[PDB]
Amino acid sequence: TTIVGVKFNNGVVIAADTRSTQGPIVADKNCAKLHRISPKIWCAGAGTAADTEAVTQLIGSNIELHSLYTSREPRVVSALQMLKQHLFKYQGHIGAYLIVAGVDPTGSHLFSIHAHGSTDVGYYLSLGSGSLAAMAVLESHWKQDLTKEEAIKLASDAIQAGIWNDLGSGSNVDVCVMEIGKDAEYLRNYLTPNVREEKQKSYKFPRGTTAVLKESIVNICD
């Protein structure tokens, strides 16, 4: 995977590619790596696919119950603390590498979490196999006081660097923008620069090509 996070004027934006591997084989050409912990706290995940999904859902569930209990909108630091303490307890065996971001009554935030339970703070971050390709772009083009449209451009460019140059990443670019005072917008397939070309030939077989031994109606009803 390639995943990034970029802070801007009035909030934060995160992005991710959509490739899912299984050894050298591409299992899913368009999987969703952007996860919703709460309405305005989102999470980009890299590493063991089941772990990033499971850990994000568990903490997301507990965050919802906490929000109802306290009658308050959830904070990013709460999600951060709950995630890191969970991961640390499992001594790295739960292979989740996360970029946590969102807006809350305190302001806008951007963090990263590693499988062993260490957290880092920053204005721009990148995780996954294509993090070096992405970070190279971020280090070259990032500046202080980015606008919304500039941060989306920088974030998606960093993901593209991973898509093209890293074999672990590919296909499309997902984006989620979290601005202060507004609803978070989830931009599924924000870019689709890897469309499959028309095939040279149709492989529709003449009916009856396959040899059959038995037929039978299956009963699905009661």
């Binding site: 630091v77 890191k84 920053g122 204005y123 070096l132 390709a133 190279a136 772009v137 280090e139 070259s140």
Partner: protein, 233 residues
């Protein structure tokens, strides 16, 4: 069977409209210790080729001697040693590529990654890679070590395919290389600020730049960063 002791990190390079550019920092690391700081890892051969070497420095110095000796041997009984029968980049590469593969085949490798950059007699740009395994490949941009992971992505934004080479000037190309060297200083734990850069042009020839430094760095934003999560001070 070897293990590398004193080592050199990334070497980066690319093609442009009239020639090729190559660069590499001046560090000789001893594990985590940044032991030697005056190490030149770009070695010119004639006035038309530059060999950039990463990996073990003792093996680099051996290769230096071989190239030095190659120039001597070519001059023997050769009236056109500074003209038609001068050493080409393609000759120098193939020689090294032969040596590297012979050494790996004897289970006693020269623990290096090498990039031969230069210009041929007919004006064509030459840029090709070879390493301890004897593996060879060519591309509009080439880089070793961390450079492969961080520099190539940046350099490929300038020259993504063959047709982008005529469209790329020497000013634009050098700017990209110098930028890449800064990124490597940010992110490679075995890199140094000081580096060397070489340009081989079909018109202006060989330009060798020593004692360059990474500059125009962004560090100011660091002061705003506090704690690792919930600290406010």
């Amino acid at each position: 069977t070897q293990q590398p002791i004193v080592t050199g990190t990334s070497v980066i390079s690319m093609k442009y409209d009239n020639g090729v550019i190559i660069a590499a920092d001046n560090l000789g690391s001893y594990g985590s210790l940044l032991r030697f700081n005056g190490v030149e890892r770009l070695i010119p051969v004639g006035d038309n080729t530059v060999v950039g070497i990463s990996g073990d420095i003792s093996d680099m110095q051996h290769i230096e001697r071989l190239l030095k000796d190659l120039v001597t041997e070519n001059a023997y009984d050769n009236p056109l040693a500074d003209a038609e029968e001068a050493l080409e980049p393609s000759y120098i590469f193939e020689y090294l590529a032969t040596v590297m593969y012979q050494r790996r085949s004897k289970m006693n490798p020269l623990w290096n990654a090498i990039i031969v950059a230069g210009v041929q007699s007919n004006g064509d740009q030459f840029l090709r890679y070879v390493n301890l395994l004897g593996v060879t490949y060519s591309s509009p941009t080439l880089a070793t070590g961390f450079g492969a992971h961080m520099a190539n992505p940046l350099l490929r934004k300038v020259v993504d395919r063959e047709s982008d080479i005529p469209k790329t000037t020497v000013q634009v190309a050098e700017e990209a290389i110098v930028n890449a060297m800064r990124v490597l200083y940010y992110r490679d734990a075995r890199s140094s600020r000081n580096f060397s850069l070489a340009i081989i042009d079909k018109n202006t020839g060989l330009t060798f730049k020593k004692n360059l430094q990474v500059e125009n760095m962004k560090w100011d934003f660091a002061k705003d960063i506090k704690g690792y999560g919930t600290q406010k001070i």
